[PDB]
Structure 1
Amino acid sequence: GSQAVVTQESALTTSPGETVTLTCRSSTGAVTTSNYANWVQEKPDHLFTGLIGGTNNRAPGVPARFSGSLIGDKAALTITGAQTEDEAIYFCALWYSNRWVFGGGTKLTVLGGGGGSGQVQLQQPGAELVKPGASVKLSCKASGYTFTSYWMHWVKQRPGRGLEWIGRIDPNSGGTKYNEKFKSKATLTVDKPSSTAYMQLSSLTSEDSAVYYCARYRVYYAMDYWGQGTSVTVSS
């Protein structure tokens, strides 16, 4: 199959102090708790952080004004009292049996000045230039937590185009799950001494030019902490 499409509002405009609800629809029918909906916020300069996962579980440190739920046949993120710093692009991700599928993202605009209410690191190298047909080994160094206690995800962004889930590794086990789209193009591995996750992209091509993020994932919870992304450019 793999014809499932996730759609979100293109844009929403609000003011400080208002209640805004972003929704996430599945093309296959209703969104269910078996879609374990995740919500991720992109602030300017491609800074990602996960807010919600498992429909309603809250990421570490996410402000009280955010909450997740199912509303009718959609997943929904509600901001109860929007603040100017909430101006961002919000992406949902739905689980479809063996892969995550990201929506297109909602750009939230917060108009007018206002008020509002006021550790773990993943370290990725900024860039990598590769020659066609070669490989790259991408690193993601985790610090601040027990490395083997959390899964690690990899996400591809061709910027402007969208987000695509590549796959997942359990550091404790070495067990992997790959998006079929990348099952032979990508291999996930770890080094537990150095607490480093690695993704190898075999025999590259021009489509492969993108930013690749690693993201810490707690099963049933959020894709919470993200690396800065490695910009991989292919010489053409």
Structure 2
Amino acid sequence: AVVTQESALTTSPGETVTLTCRSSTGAVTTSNYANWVQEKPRHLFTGLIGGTNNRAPGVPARFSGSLIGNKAALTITGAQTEDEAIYFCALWYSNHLVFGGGTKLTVL
């Protein structure tokens, strides 16, 4: 099972931007418990969202999770300059976790 993300996406500050997480085995479901993790420069990692839509405590409410079509999605509603980073998603397959390649989000 292979998880694919957008390689890199551009947005402007204040705009809304959606990252996606695709499964090779088919459509992503709640039983994949999609996770989203953020990497900022200097290898600073922060869990954002797991189980599709549940935010970790302290995580800004502008990050939200959902299923759109056949994919899990991270939407950022009102992108901030500090949100410029790499976003990894992770799907659960019933006995193991698989990370996608990660998306580089640039904020103009």
Say whether the fold is shared (TM-score over 0.5). yes
The alignment-based identity, stated in percent, is: 96
Deviation at 1:15, TM superposition (A): 0.5
Deviation at 1:69, TM superposition (A): 0.3
Which residue of the partner structure matches residue 48 of structure 1?
45
Q: Secondary structure at the match of 1:101?
A: strand
Deviation at 1:72, TM superposition (A): 0.7
Deviation at 1:32, TM superposition (A): 0.5
String of CA shifts for 1:58-104, please: whole Å, max 9, x gaps: 10100011100000100000000000000000000000010000000
In the alignment, structure 2 segments of 5+ residues that lack a partner are none
String of CA shifts for 1:170-224, please: whole Å, max 9, x gaps: xxxxxxxxxxxxxxxxxxxxxxxxxxxxxxxxxxxxxxxxxxxxxxxxxxxxxxx
How far apart are the structure 2 equivalents of 1:64 and 1:75? 17
Deviation at 1:54, TM superposition (A): 0.2
How far apart are the structure 2 equivalents of 1:16 and 1:80? 10
Which residue of the partner structure matches residue 36 of structure 1?
33
How far apart are the structure 2 equivalents of 1:24 and 1:56? 13
Q: Secondary structure at the match of 1:34?
A: helix
How far apart are the structure 1 equivalents of 2:39 and 2:101? 12
How far apart are the structure 2 equivalents of 1:36 and 1:19? 23
TM-score (norm 1): 0.46
Q: Secondary structure at the match of 1:22?
A: strand
How far apart are the structure 1 equivalents of 2:39 and 2:97? 17
Write the mapping of 1:84-233 to structure 2, written as runs, cut at 5 A: 84-111=81-108
How many residues end up aligned between the 2 structures?
A: 108
Which has the bigger relative contact order, CA under 8 A and spacing at least 6?
Answer: 2
How far apart are the structure 2 equivalents of 1:53 and 1:97? 15
Q: Secondary structure at the match of 2:58?
A: coil
RMSD: 0.4
Q: Which has the larger radius of gyration?
A: 1
String of CA shifts for 1:11-69, please: whole Å, max 9, x gaps: 00000000000000000000000000000000001110100000000101000111000
How far apart are the structure 2 equivalents of 1:83 and 1:62? 13
In the alignment, structure 1 segments of 5+ residues that lack a partner are 112-236
Which 4+ residue blocks in structure 1 deviate beyond 3 angstroms? none
TM-score (norm 2): 0.99
